[PDB]
Ligand SMILES: CC(=O)N[C@H]1[C@H](O[C@H]2[C@@H](O)[C@@H](CO)O[C@@H](O[C@H]3[C@H](O)[C@@H](O)[C@H](O)O[C@@H]3CO)[C@@H]2O)O[C@H](CO)[C@@H](O)[C@@H]1O[C@@H]1O[C@H](CO)[C@H](O)[C@H](O)[C@H]1O
Ligand SMILES: [Cl-]
Ligand SMILES: [Cl-]
């Protein structure tokens with residue numbers, strides 16, 4: 001059934017290439033943000049952050065947080081989410097990037113800044129969503 005948000009999905013032994021993480025949920029009406037945070041302890045290896053109202057625009061911000069400091073943002077103006085609507089996010093771990101698809105369409109890639117993939121052992125899911133499922137498999 002429904003999952004509680006914020007939700008913490010353990011990734012035992014960290015991530016590896018060919019691991020596929022699938023998140024299903026629905027965006028709340030009047031949403032402000034969604035965030036997926038792949039964590040290495042206190043560090044955020046990959047923060048994927050759709051913003052519904054940044055200066056009255058919709059944008060996806062991606063970044064990494066090391067020692068409590070955010071790095072250089074990567075921004076994507078292609079925005080597949082909509083308030084009130086169900087979505088599927090798939091994150092595929094590849095050798096050199098995370099690859100993100102939304103509703104079965106490729107969205108973006110993010111080059112690995114944190115290189116100890118085996119230590120990226122939690123995924124935090126937060127924001128203005130109803131969360132239906134969060135799981136992983138190997139492809
Ligand atoms: C205030 C807030 O929303 N804090 C969030 C945190 O948000 C930061 C990230 O999204 C980064 C990504 O680059 O951007 C930061 O804003 C940038 C902005 O994009 C730039 O235009 C501007 O120049 O600089 C600012 C600041 O660098 C966001 O502030 O995201 C994390 C990870 O999802 C959240 O945890 C955090 O929310 C707080 O989390 C706390 C627990 O860790 C508490 O729950 C607290 O109540 C939250 O506010
Ligand atoms: Cl961790
Ligand atoms: Cl922060």
Ligand SMILES: [Cl-]
Nearest residue numbers: 052081082083
């Ligand atoms: Cl919207």
Ligand SMILES: [Cl-]
Nearest residue numbers: 094095096097
């Ligand atoms: Cl790759």
Ligand SMILES: [Cl-]
Nearest residue numbers: 113114115116
């Ligand atoms: Cl590292």
